[PDB]
mmCIF file of C-alpha atoms and ligand atoms in Angstrom:
data_model
loop_
_atom_site.group_PDB
_atom_site.id
_atom_site.type_symbol
_atom_site.label_atom_id
_atom_site.label_comp_id
_atom_site.label_asym_id
_atom_site.label_seq_id
_atom_site.Cartn_x
_atom_site.Cartn_y
_atom_site.Cartn_z
ATOM 1 C CA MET A 9 2.114 9.061 -26.508
ATOM 2 C CA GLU A 10 3.893 11.813 -28.994
ATOM 3 C CA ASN A 11 4.598 13.990 -26.127
ATOM 4 C CA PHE A 12 6.667 11.438 -24.074
ATOM 5 C CA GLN A 13 9.011 9.173 -24.450
ATOM 6 C CA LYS A 14 8.966 6.052 -22.547
ATOM 7 C CA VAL A 15 12.870 5.654 -21.456
ATOM 8 C CA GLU A 16 11.752 2.399 -19.847
ATOM 9 C CA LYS A 17 8.103 0.697 -18.223
ATOM 10 C CA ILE A 18 8.875 1.081 -14.606
ATOM 11 C CA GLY A 19 6.079 -1.632 -12.786
ATOM 12 C CA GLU A 20 2.578 -3.136 -14.007
ATOM 13 C CA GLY A 21 0.062 -2.090 -10.710
ATOM 14 C CA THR A 22 -2.955 -3.639 -10.692
ATOM 15 C CA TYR A 23 -4.813 -0.989 -12.886
ATOM 16 C CA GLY A 24 -2.596 -0.355 -15.319
ATOM 17 C CA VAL A 25 1.256 -0.309 -16.357
ATOM 18 C CA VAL A 26 3.579 2.688 -15.643
ATOM 19 C CA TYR A 27 6.336 4.326 -17.185
ATOM 20 C CA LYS A 28 9.242 6.470 -17.098
ATOM 21 C CA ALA A 29 9.562 8.927 -19.487
ATOM 22 C CA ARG A 30 10.547 12.061 -21.008
ATOM 23 C CA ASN A 31 8.341 14.746 -22.436
ATOM 24 C CA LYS A 32 9.804 15.601 -25.034
ATOM 25 C CA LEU A 33 8.326 19.174 -25.227
ATOM 26 C CA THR A 34 9.994 20.182 -21.561
ATOM 27 C CA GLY A 35 12.793 17.644 -20.996
ATOM 28 C CA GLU A 36 10.707 16.775 -17.686
ATOM 29 C CA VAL A 37 11.469 13.233 -16.253
ATOM 30 C CA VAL A 38 7.646 11.499 -14.970
ATOM 31 C CA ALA A 39 6.137 8.516 -14.445
ATOM 32 C CA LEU A 40 2.682 7.501 -16.552
ATOM 33 C CA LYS A 41 0.610 5.774 -15.865
ATOM 34 C CA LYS A 42 -1.599 4.184 -18.376
ATOM 35 C CA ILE A 43 -4.977 2.995 -17.611
ATOM 36 C CA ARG A 44 -6.718 0.049 -19.301
ATOM 37 C CA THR A 49 -11.337 0.763 -22.305
ATOM 38 C CA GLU A 50 -14.599 1.347 -23.725
ATOM 39 C CA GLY A 51 -15.823 4.830 -22.460
ATOM 40 C CA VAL A 52 -14.350 5.358 -19.645
ATOM 41 C CA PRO A 53 -16.184 6.624 -16.578
ATOM 42 C CA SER A 54 -16.151 10.157 -16.560
ATOM 43 C CA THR A 55 -17.425 9.597 -12.601
ATOM 44 C CA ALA A 56 -13.714 8.177 -11.681
ATOM 45 C CA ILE A 57 -12.173 11.369 -14.081
ATOM 46 C CA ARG A 58 -13.558 14.116 -12.035
ATOM 47 C CA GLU A 59 -12.368 11.991 -9.120
ATOM 48 C CA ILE A 60 -9.125 11.157 -9.851
ATOM 49 C CA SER A 61 -9.348 14.881 -11.338
ATOM 50 C CA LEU A 62 -9.940 15.748 -7.052
ATOM 51 C CA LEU A 63 -6.648 13.743 -6.241
ATOM 52 C CA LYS A 64 -4.382 16.333 -8.526
ATOM 53 C CA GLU A 65 -4.824 19.111 -5.143
ATOM 54 C CA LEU A 66 -3.337 16.570 -2.944
ATOM 55 C CA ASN A 67 -0.552 17.933 -1.742
ATOM 56 C CA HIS A 68 1.985 16.182 1.042
ATOM 57 C CA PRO A 69 5.219 15.647 1.235
ATOM 58 C CA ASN A 70 4.351 12.051 1.676
ATOM 59 C CA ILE A 71 2.099 11.430 -1.195
ATOM 60 C CA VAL A 72 3.241 11.406 -4.993
ATOM 61 C CA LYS A 73 2.454 14.604 -7.188
ATOM 62 C CA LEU A 74 -0.006 13.448 -9.812
ATOM 63 C CA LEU A 75 0.389 16.307 -12.075
ATOM 64 C CA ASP A 76 -2.564 15.557 -14.860
ATOM 65 C CA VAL A 77 -4.999 13.165 -15.811
ATOM 66 C CA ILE A 78 -5.804 13.048 -19.602
ATOM 67 C CA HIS A 79 -8.914 11.287 -21.074
ATOM 68 C CA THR A 80 -7.752 10.494 -24.806
ATOM 69 C CA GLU A 81 -8.521 7.985 -27.412
ATOM 70 C CA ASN A 82 -9.638 5.034 -25.171
ATOM 71 C CA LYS A 83 -7.178 5.399 -22.960
ATOM 72 C CA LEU A 84 -6.774 7.043 -19.094
ATOM 73 C CA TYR A 85 -3.002 8.574 -18.565
ATOM 74 C CA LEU A 86 -1.897 9.393 -15.391
ATOM 75 C CA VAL A 87 1.030 12.139 -15.298
ATOM 76 C CA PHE A 88 3.442 11.659 -11.960
ATOM 77 C CA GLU A 89 6.378 13.071 -10.484
ATOM 78 C CA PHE A 90 9.135 10.233 -10.934
ATOM 79 C CA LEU A 91 10.795 9.313 -8.118
ATOM 80 C CA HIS A 92 14.455 7.331 -7.638
ATOM 81 C CA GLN A 93 13.464 3.487 -6.553
ATOM 82 C CA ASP A 94 10.248 1.860 -5.303
ATOM 83 C CA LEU A 95 10.408 -0.005 -1.857
ATOM 84 C CA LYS A 96 9.852 -3.388 -3.626
ATOM 85 C CA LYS A 97 13.249 -3.236 -4.859
ATOM 86 C CA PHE A 98 15.367 -1.020 -2.136
ATOM 87 C CA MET A 99 14.194 -3.809 0.286
ATOM 88 C CA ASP A 100 15.127 -6.626 -2.333
ATOM 89 C CA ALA A 101 18.589 -4.557 -2.583
ATOM 90 C CA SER A 102 18.859 -4.539 1.244
ATOM 91 C CA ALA A 103 18.200 -8.685 1.840
ATOM 92 C CA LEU A 104 21.468 -9.493 2.404
ATOM 93 C CA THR A 105 21.800 -6.574 5.051
ATOM 94 C CA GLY A 106 18.372 -5.192 6.068
ATOM 95 C CA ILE A 107 17.031 -1.610 6.031
ATOM 96 C CA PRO A 108 19.096 -0.271 9.657
ATOM 97 C CA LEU A 109 16.415 -0.136 12.145
ATOM 98 C CA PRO A 110 16.231 3.747 12.058
ATOM 99 C CA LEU A 111 15.328 3.969 8.258
ATOM 100 C CA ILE A 112 12.836 1.868 8.293
ATOM 101 C CA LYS A 113 11.207 3.226 11.253
ATOM 102 C CA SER A 114 11.564 6.542 9.452
ATOM 103 C CA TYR A 115 9.820 5.573 6.596
ATOM 104 C CA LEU A 116 6.655 4.516 8.494
ATOM 105 C CA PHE A 117 6.720 7.850 10.469
ATOM 106 C CA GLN A 118 6.909 9.304 7.621
ATOM 107 C CA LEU A 119 3.745 6.907 5.502
ATOM 108 C CA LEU A 120 2.185 7.899 8.910
ATOM 109 C CA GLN A 121 2.315 11.119 8.200
ATOM 110 C CA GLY A 122 0.735 11.167 4.552
ATOM 111 C CA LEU A 123 -2.250 8.976 4.948
ATOM 112 C CA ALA A 124 -3.081 10.826 8.453
ATOM 113 C CA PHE A 125 -3.334 13.623 5.865
ATOM 114 C CA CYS A 126 -5.202 11.579 3.486
ATOM 115 C CA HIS A 127 -6.944 10.372 5.604
ATOM 116 C CA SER A 128 -8.198 13.423 7.293
ATOM 117 C CA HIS A 129 -9.652 14.943 3.333
ATOM 118 C CA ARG A 130 -11.345 11.200 3.348
ATOM 119 C CA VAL A 131 -9.039 9.935 0.768
ATOM 120 C CA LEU A 132 -7.979 6.252 1.026
ATOM 121 C CA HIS A 133 -5.454 4.368 -0.587
ATOM 122 C CA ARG A 134 -6.733 1.001 -0.405
ATOM 123 C CA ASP A 135 -3.877 -1.062 -2.260
ATOM 124 C CA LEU A 136 -0.714 -0.012 -0.817
ATOM 125 C CA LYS A 137 1.965 -2.235 -1.183
ATOM 126 C CA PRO A 138 5.775 -2.301 -0.908
ATOM 127 C CA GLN A 139 5.614 -1.199 -4.989
ATOM 128 C CA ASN A 140 3.552 1.538 -3.923
ATOM 129 C CA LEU A 141 5.825 3.059 -2.155
ATOM 130 C CA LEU A 142 8.511 5.286 -3.739
ATOM 131 C CA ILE A 143 11.895 6.623 -1.661
ATOM 132 C CA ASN A 144 14.293 9.216 -2.996
ATOM 133 C CA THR A 145 18.420 10.129 -1.886
ATOM 134 C CA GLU A 146 16.950 12.821 0.138
ATOM 135 C CA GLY A 147 15.426 10.259 2.984
ATOM 136 C CA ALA A 148 12.044 10.629 1.883
ATOM 137 C CA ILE A 149 9.657 8.378 1.374
ATOM 138 C CA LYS A 150 6.194 8.916 -0.267
ATOM 139 C CA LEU A 151 2.420 7.062 -1.181
ATOM 140 C CA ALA A 152 1.458 6.196 -4.610
ATOM 141 C CA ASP A 153 -1.596 5.940 -6.236
ATOM 142 C CA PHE A 154 -4.219 6.445 -4.463
ATOM 143 C CA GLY A 155 -7.884 6.454 -5.430
ATOM 144 C CA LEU A 156 -9.042 4.420 -8.263
ATOM 145 C CA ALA A 157 -11.014 1.454 -5.723
ATOM 146 C CA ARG A 158 -13.009 4.674 -5.490
ATOM 147 C CA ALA A 159 -13.445 5.622 -8.764
ATOM 148 C CA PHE A 160 -13.217 1.888 -9.937
ATOM 149 C CA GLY A 161 -13.652 -0.962 -8.258
ATOM 150 C CA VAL A 162 -12.158 -3.979 -6.810
ATOM 151 C CA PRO A 163 -10.287 -5.416 -9.381
ATOM 152 C CA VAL A 164 -10.146 -8.662 -9.955
ATOM 153 C CA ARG A 165 -8.526 -9.117 -13.980
ATOM 154 C CA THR A 166 -6.529 -6.831 -15.004
ATOM 155 C CA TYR A 167 -5.854 -6.436 -18.404
ATOM 156 C CA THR A 168 -2.873 -7.852 -18.441
ATOM 157 C CA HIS A 169 -4.086 -11.013 -16.652
ATOM 158 C CA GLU A 170 -1.086 -9.403 -13.732
ATOM 159 C CA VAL A 171 -0.643 -11.954 -10.875
ATOM 160 C CA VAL A 172 -2.555 -9.378 -8.532
ATOM 161 C CA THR A 173 -1.088 -9.034 -4.595
ATOM 162 C CA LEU A 174 -3.298 -10.029 -1.662
ATOM 163 C CA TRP A 175 -0.318 -9.914 0.633
ATOM 164 C CA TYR A 176 -1.540 -6.485 1.607
ATOM 165 C CA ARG A 177 -5.489 -7.095 2.042
ATOM 166 C CA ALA A 178 -7.321 -5.609 5.441
ATOM 167 C CA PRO A 179 -9.448 -9.094 6.489
ATOM 168 C CA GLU A 180 -12.441 -7.345 6.381
ATOM 169 C CA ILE A 181 -11.743 -7.069 2.424
ATOM 170 C CA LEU A 182 -10.674 -10.798 2.273
ATOM 171 C CA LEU A 183 -14.141 -11.061 4.294
ATOM 172 C CA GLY A 184 -16.253 -9.431 1.998
ATOM 173 C CA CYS A 185 -17.298 -5.797 3.597
ATOM 174 C CA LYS A 186 -18.607 -3.785 1.411
ATOM 175 C CA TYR A 187 -17.626 -0.509 3.706
ATOM 176 C CA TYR A 188 -13.823 -0.280 3.313
ATOM 177 C CA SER A 189 -12.810 2.251 6.289
ATOM 178 C CA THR A 190 -8.985 3.981 6.488
ATOM 179 C CA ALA A 191 -8.252 1.291 9.258
ATOM 180 C CA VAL A 192 -7.297 -0.715 5.692
ATOM 181 C CA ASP A 193 -4.353 1.262 4.749
ATOM 182 C CA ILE A 194 -3.062 0.961 8.604
ATOM 183 C CA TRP A 195 -3.053 -2.958 7.332
ATOM 184 C CA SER A 196 -1.515 -2.704 4.463
ATOM 185 C CA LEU A 197 1.393 -0.662 6.090
ATOM 186 C CA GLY A 198 1.707 -2.225 8.940
ATOM 187 C CA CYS A 199 2.666 -5.806 7.091
ATOM 188 C CA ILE A 200 4.704 -3.566 5.073
ATOM 189 C CA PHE A 201 6.803 -2.643 8.183
ATOM 190 C CA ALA A 202 6.995 -5.781 8.920
ATOM 191 C CA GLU A 203 8.328 -6.981 6.094
ATOM 192 C CA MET A 204 10.814 -4.695 5.964
ATOM 193 C CA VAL A 205 11.949 -5.466 9.388
ATOM 194 C CA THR A 206 12.280 -8.887 8.801
ATOM 195 C CA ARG A 207 12.603 -9.607 5.313
ATOM 196 C CA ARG A 208 10.484 -11.421 4.847
ATOM 197 C CA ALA A 209 6.705 -10.988 3.199
ATOM 198 C CA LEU A 210 4.112 -11.621 6.662
ATOM 199 C CA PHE A 211 1.353 -13.393 4.876
ATOM 200 C CA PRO A 212 2.029 -14.028 1.759
ATOM 201 C CA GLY A 213 -0.574 -16.045 0.816
ATOM 202 C CA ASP A 214 -1.177 -17.234 -3.580
ATOM 203 C CA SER A 215 -5.315 -17.385 -3.344
ATOM 204 C CA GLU A 216 -7.850 -15.230 -1.561
ATOM 205 C CA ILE A 217 -8.570 -18.128 0.908
ATOM 206 C CA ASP A 218 -4.943 -18.661 1.788
ATOM 207 C CA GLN A 219 -4.235 -14.709 2.207
ATOM 208 C CA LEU A 220 -7.562 -15.118 4.655
ATOM 209 C CA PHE A 221 -6.011 -18.676 6.313
ATOM 210 C CA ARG A 222 -2.352 -17.501 6.743
ATOM 211 C CA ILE A 223 -3.395 -14.449 8.679
ATOM 212 C CA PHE A 224 -5.486 -16.902 11.337
ATOM 213 C CA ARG A 225 -2.446 -19.232 12.001
ATOM 214 C CA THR A 226 -0.781 -16.229 12.688
ATOM 215 C CA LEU A 227 -3.333 -13.806 14.736
ATOM 216 C CA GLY A 228 -5.494 -16.515 15.370
ATOM 217 C CA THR A 229 -8.703 -17.309 14.099
ATOM 218 C CA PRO A 230 -11.004 -14.026 14.902
ATOM 219 C CA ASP A 231 -14.657 -14.836 17.189
ATOM 220 C CA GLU A 232 -17.438 -12.187 17.887
ATOM 221 C CA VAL A 233 -15.137 -11.268 20.770
ATOM 222 C CA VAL A 234 -12.190 -9.776 19.400
ATOM 223 C CA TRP A 235 -14.248 -8.624 16.876
ATOM 224 C CA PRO A 236 -18.098 -8.158 17.039
ATOM 225 C CA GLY A 237 -19.885 -8.642 13.654
ATOM 226 C CA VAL A 238 -17.699 -10.521 12.422
ATOM 227 C CA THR A 239 -19.048 -13.306 12.002
ATOM 228 C CA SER A 240 -22.068 -12.235 10.151
ATOM 229 C CA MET A 241 -19.540 -11.175 7.479
ATOM 230 C CA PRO A 242 -20.738 -11.457 3.688
ATOM 231 C CA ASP A 243 -18.166 -14.009 3.133
ATOM 232 C CA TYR A 244 -17.146 -15.619 7.065
ATOM 233 C CA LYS A 245 -17.972 -19.416 6.841
ATOM 234 C CA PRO A 246 -18.326 -21.156 10.300
ATOM 235 C CA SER A 247 -16.766 -23.907 8.974
ATOM 236 C CA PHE A 248 -13.375 -22.261 8.799
ATOM 237 C CA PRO A 249 -10.811 -23.898 10.694
ATOM 238 C CA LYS A 250 -10.181 -22.191 14.933
ATOM 239 C CA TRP A 251 -6.448 -21.401 15.141
ATOM 240 C CA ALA A 252 -4.860 -19.946 18.349
ATOM 241 C CA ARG A 253 -3.293 -16.857 18.396
ATOM 242 C CA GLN A 254 0.837 -17.612 17.782
ATOM 243 C CA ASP A 255 3.300 -15.976 20.468
ATOM 244 C CA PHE A 256 3.068 -12.374 19.010
ATOM 245 C CA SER A 257 7.059 -12.698 20.094
ATOM 246 C CA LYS A 258 7.754 -14.810 16.701
ATOM 247 C CA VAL A 259 5.918 -12.268 14.710
ATOM 248 C CA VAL A 260 8.854 -10.042 14.356
ATOM 249 C CA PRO A 261 11.771 -10.769 16.734
ATOM 250 C CA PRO A 262 14.403 -7.876 15.839
ATOM 251 C CA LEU A 263 11.772 -5.472 17.115
ATOM 252 C CA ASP A 264 11.986 -4.236 20.368
ATOM 253 C CA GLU A 265 8.833 -3.877 22.408
ATOM 254 C CA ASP A 266 7.958 -0.370 21.205
ATOM 255 C CA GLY A 267 7.559 -1.328 17.562
ATOM 256 C CA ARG A 268 6.035 -4.543 18.711
ATOM 257 C CA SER A 269 3.458 -2.702 20.361
ATOM 258 C CA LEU A 270 2.916 -0.267 17.323
ATOM 259 C CA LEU A 271 2.850 -3.520 14.840
ATOM 260 C CA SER A 272 -0.422 -5.042 17.235
ATOM 261 C CA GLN A 273 -2.533 -2.742 17.170
ATOM 262 C CA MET A 274 -1.916 -1.750 13.314
ATOM 263 C CA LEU A 275 -3.347 -5.043 12.697
ATOM 264 C CA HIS A 276 -5.949 -5.724 15.367
ATOM 265 C CA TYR A 277 -8.969 -7.556 13.736
ATOM 266 C CA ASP A 278 -11.824 -5.132 14.751
ATOM 267 C CA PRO A 279 -11.103 -2.348 11.701
ATOM 268 C CA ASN A 280 -12.743 0.176 14.960
ATOM 269 C CA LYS A 281 -9.823 -0.836 17.030
ATOM 270 C CA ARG A 282 -7.200 -0.598 14.582
ATOM 271 C CA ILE A 283 -5.087 1.896 15.242
ATOM 272 C CA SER A 284 -5.320 5.304 13.561
ATOM 273 C CA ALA A 285 -2.442 6.988 10.955
ATOM 274 C CA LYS A 286 -2.991 10.630 13.583
ATOM 275 C CA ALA A 287 -2.230 7.827 17.065
ATOM 276 C CA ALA A 288 0.493 6.046 15.602
ATOM 277 C CA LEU A 289 2.531 9.024 15.015
ATOM 278 C CA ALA A 290 2.101 9.702 18.833
ATOM 279 C CA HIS A 291 3.305 5.820 19.285
ATOM 280 C CA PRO A 292 6.333 5.607 21.759
ATOM 281 C CA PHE A 293 7.598 3.553 19.017
ATOM 282 C CA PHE A 294 8.891 7.146 17.390
ATOM 283 C CA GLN A 295 9.861 9.133 20.312
ATOM 284 C CA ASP A 296 13.770 8.891 18.694
ATOM 285 C CA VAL A 297 12.941 9.279 15.113
ATOM 286 C CA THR A 298 15.461 10.589 12.985
ATOM 287 C CA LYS A 299 15.442 11.040 8.880
ATOM 288 C CA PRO A 300 18.444 8.630 8.116
ATOM 289 C CA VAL A 301 19.372 8.822 4.241
ATOM 290 C CA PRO A 302 19.424 5.690 2.732
ATOM 291 C CA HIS A 303 22.437 4.375 0.415
ATOM 292 C CA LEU A 304 20.820 3.740 -2.765
ATOM 293 C CA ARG A 305 22.313 2.228 -6.030
ATOM 294 C CA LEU A 306 20.418 3.953 -9.147
HETATM 295 C C1 LIG B 401 2.145 2.997 -8.920
HETATM 296 O O1 LIG B 401 1.905 4.262 -9.543
HETATM 297 C C2 LIG B 401 2.972 4.836 -9.161
HETATM 298 C C3 LIG B 401 2.530 6.152 -9.762
HETATM 299 C C4 LIG B 401 3.859 7.333 -9.639
HETATM 300 C C5 LIG B 401 5.193 6.414 -9.849
HETATM 301 C C6 LIG B 401 5.436 5.661 -9.705
HETATM 302 C C7 LIG B 401 4.456 4.752 -10.176
HETATM 303 C C8 LIG B 401 7.209 5.213 -9.736
HETATM 304 C C9 LIG B 401 7.978 3.834 -9.824
HETATM 305 C C10 LIG B 401 9.170 4.147 -9.797
HETATM 306 C C11 LIG B 401 9.675 2.695 -9.520
HETATM 307 N N1 LIG B 401 11.031 2.859 -9.411
HETATM 308 C C12 LIG B 401 11.075 4.072 -9.475
HETATM 309 N N2 LIG B 401 9.840 5.131 -9.503
HETATM 310 C C13 LIG B 401 7.693 6.665 -9.935
HETATM 311 O O2 LIG B 401 8.404 7.580 -9.730
HETATM 312 N N3 LIG B 401 6.178 7.751 -10.263
#
């Protein structure tokens, strides 16, 4: 840490804490994530290092990955504000639709990019999406779950957010697909539109049942194979699907159809990032500038 000055902590992720820091040597302002260890799986270290080669306008740049003193540091470029803070700051007025559309479009471009390189994020949430004054938005903190394993108890006893978890993960699937990122993004899109989280579960079963209460308890008809999933129980209550116009009312029909495709239960039917970019919703997409208070 002697190389940096921790201006201020800026967040605690499921895999570690992130600080805004200044490189005393170069004066560069960066985001430093310190990972919570014994020997530190060198296997992860190699995979994480691979991520340093991801170069995309909508992906936060990973500058360095350092293993030293039983701790792993990730040095990232620093962006102005995260989406969680921006949504909170825009709570009274709401984010303008053109800007929500712009952000969703850019996020899908970023996902289309990483997914074509066989990289999954796995834990997308508003705090992992960063924005700048120029109107860009970027995905931050990929992998980790690919190099490590699905968390449960952070070194700080952090309250892991389950709100954006795809149903196949909640039902114990062992092999995640790129579709889990589309689900998370769908949840975030709904939240930007309504100004309320879509599925705010406080436990895994509560998370699952909130999804079921809105989209209907899945069955073999809509999701072949669901009844044989690891954590599926025949005793799950059977809720009928709610009319979808109640889900994200401020949204026009193009927006609702796209969201419905991002929230399909069956990972195989759920729209891909590439197909989503072609959806009619983006026919009139533009790149507005947000009003940011830093
Ligand atoms: C979650 O992991 C990361 C990774 C890289 C990052 C930030 C967060 C991050 C967060 C942030 C929050 N408010 C301003 N920046 C930043 O600037 N760069």
